[PDB]
Amino acid sequence: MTNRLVLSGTVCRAPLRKVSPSGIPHCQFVLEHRSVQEEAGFHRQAWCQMPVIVSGHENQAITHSITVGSRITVQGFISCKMVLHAEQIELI
Amino acid sequence: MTNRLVLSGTVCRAPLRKPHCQFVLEHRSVQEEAGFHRQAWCQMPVIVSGHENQAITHSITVGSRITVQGFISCHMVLHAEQIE
């Protein structure tokens, strides 16, 4: 059932944008995550460069406010090379 | 900042107790996207460290259906905090 990733980070690659023949807009960028996480009582650095895709009309708008350096939080499902398919985007 | 993955799947690689247990989780689901249903698939390496989750771990065998929660890190692996 469950497949949900919430990941904050800094955009390290600006949105590449395109539209399919059928008229579906797609936007792809990369989210660089860095943080300290707790695991079994010890602090450890977590790092990931996560490709993000925003598909469909409904979330394209906010995307135009995202550039390299933008701090955001993306919520969505992962699909595998791994990509995070954005369902929600929060501008930090 | 936020780093939280909740993933359900089937164990495709039997847990090897290395102090941490490591295995691979195969996920397959149908997800909704841009008006359409799109299948999603991943084979996620999972690491469970913490004696709290070591009883459940050693029951798990390939084919077991579990739900895991934790943070992701790229060496990509899921460092599991909880596992049902």
From Swiss-Prot, chain B:
Effect of residue 39 to A: Increased binding to DnaT, loads DnaB replicative helicase
A single GO cellular-component term on record: primosome complex
GO MF assignments: identical protein binding; single-stranded DNA binding
PROSITE patterns: SSB
Induction text: Induced by hydroxyurea.
Domain of life: Bacteria
Protein family membership: Belongs to the PriB family.
The protein's name: Replication restart protein PriB
Gene name, Swiss-Prot/TrEMBL: priB
